[model samples]
Target: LQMAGQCSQNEYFDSLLHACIPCQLRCSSNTPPLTCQRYCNASVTNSVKC
Candidate 1:
């Protein structure tokens, strides 16, 4: 592990375990600085964007 590189948009870095882990696949990921979010995609009129 040694430490890490970086997880940009859709991944999370594990501080204690030295592992690069994944976020939920459905929404991808975004940041309110750091948040795993359920974004309501406006292009689909259905609420199925989650």
Candidate 2:
């Protein structure tokens, strides 16, 4: 009954962003993936931010 824990085969749950991440964006090789994003500390304003 938890949609948060429910995802497709190529999909992954991102607790950081609280969503499902799909391939084709960045962090996936098809053979291998970014849920929400990498090093997600809620990048807001910084030199190396989102």
Candidate 3:
């Protein structure tokens, strides 16, 4: 199936910045994956953030 656009790998699509960023503070292969906890947050609007 064709999926809608979203952040991939280690980044999250920031609604505030309108761009993707690291799921955590920094990029690392050992970092745990970020799950979608909710929709809106302090700085983020509608995009996903860790």
Candidate 4:
């Protein structure tokens, strides 16, 4: 089974990684913009968006 996209309890969605990650860590990823800004997401607790 594929678990990369699945999120367990207390896990939040990681759009860049396409997986679930811890919110406290503060996720920093690459994209169109050269500099990625870290932002907290309201939808997922303990989750960050790049």
Candidate 5:
């Protein structure tokens, strides 16, 4: 979806970006046995000044 350019004018970049998320790997450490967190820490942090 990303590599190929979108054809429609109504295409949403944000929704397209989310589809690229890799769900195969664990979000955090797997120890002792095996555990997985539903979601990892946020990746991007920014403050915009208006």
Candidate 6:
């Protein structure tokens, strides 16, 4: 496979194999950053604006 205009496979790619950037989708990922933000906001309703 290729990415960032390169044809390589190493720890650099391994670390990002499951990256969760907003523009791309992770079909098998389960970590939703927004959900954590929402939960944190619920406890600090006075300052949270989610």
Question: Against the true structure, whose TM-score is highest?
Answer: 2
Taken over the whole model, the C-alpha lDDT of each candidate is: 0.46, 0.46, 0.45, 0.44, 0.32, 0.35
Tell me the tens digit of each residue's lDDT in model 3 across 4-48: 266565456566667776544432333334443222132244446
Instruction: Compose the digit string of candidate 4's lDDT tens values, residues 1-50.
Output: 33655666546555667676654355332322212123333322353555
- After superposition, candidate 2 runs with Cα above 4 Å error: 27-50
* Candidate 3 lDDT score at position 45: 43
Question: How do all the candidates rank in terms of TM-score, highest first?
Answer: 2, 1, 3, 4, 6, 5
TM-score, candidate 2, is 0.36
How would you encode candidate 2's per-residue C-alpha lDDT over 1-50 as one tens digit per residue? Answer: 34665686456555665666654333333322334344232322345654
Residue pairs with clashing backbones, model 1: none
Clashes of 3: 0
The per-residue C-alpha lDDT of model 6 at residue 31 equals 34
lDDT for model 6, on a 0 to 1 scale? Answer: 0.35
- Flag clash pairs in model 3: none
lDDT of 6 by residue, 1-50 (tens): 44544522221233356432331122124433343444433433453454
Provide the clash count, candidate 6. Answer: 0
What is the TM-score of candidate 3? 0.32
Q: List TM-scores for all candidates, in order.
A: 0.35, 0.36, 0.32, 0.32, 0.17, 0.21
| Tens-digit lDDT string for candidate 5 (3-50) | 346433322234636433332233333311122122233322235752
Candidate 6: list runs displaced more than 4 Å.
Answer: 1-35, 47-50
Q: Provide the lDDT at 19 for model 1.
A: 62
Tell me which of candidates 3 and 5 scores higher on TM-score. 3
lDDT of 5 at 14: 43
In model 5, what are the clashing residue pairs, if there are any? none
User: Between 1 and 2, whose TM-score is larger?
Assistant: 2
- For candidate 3, the lDDT comes to 0.45
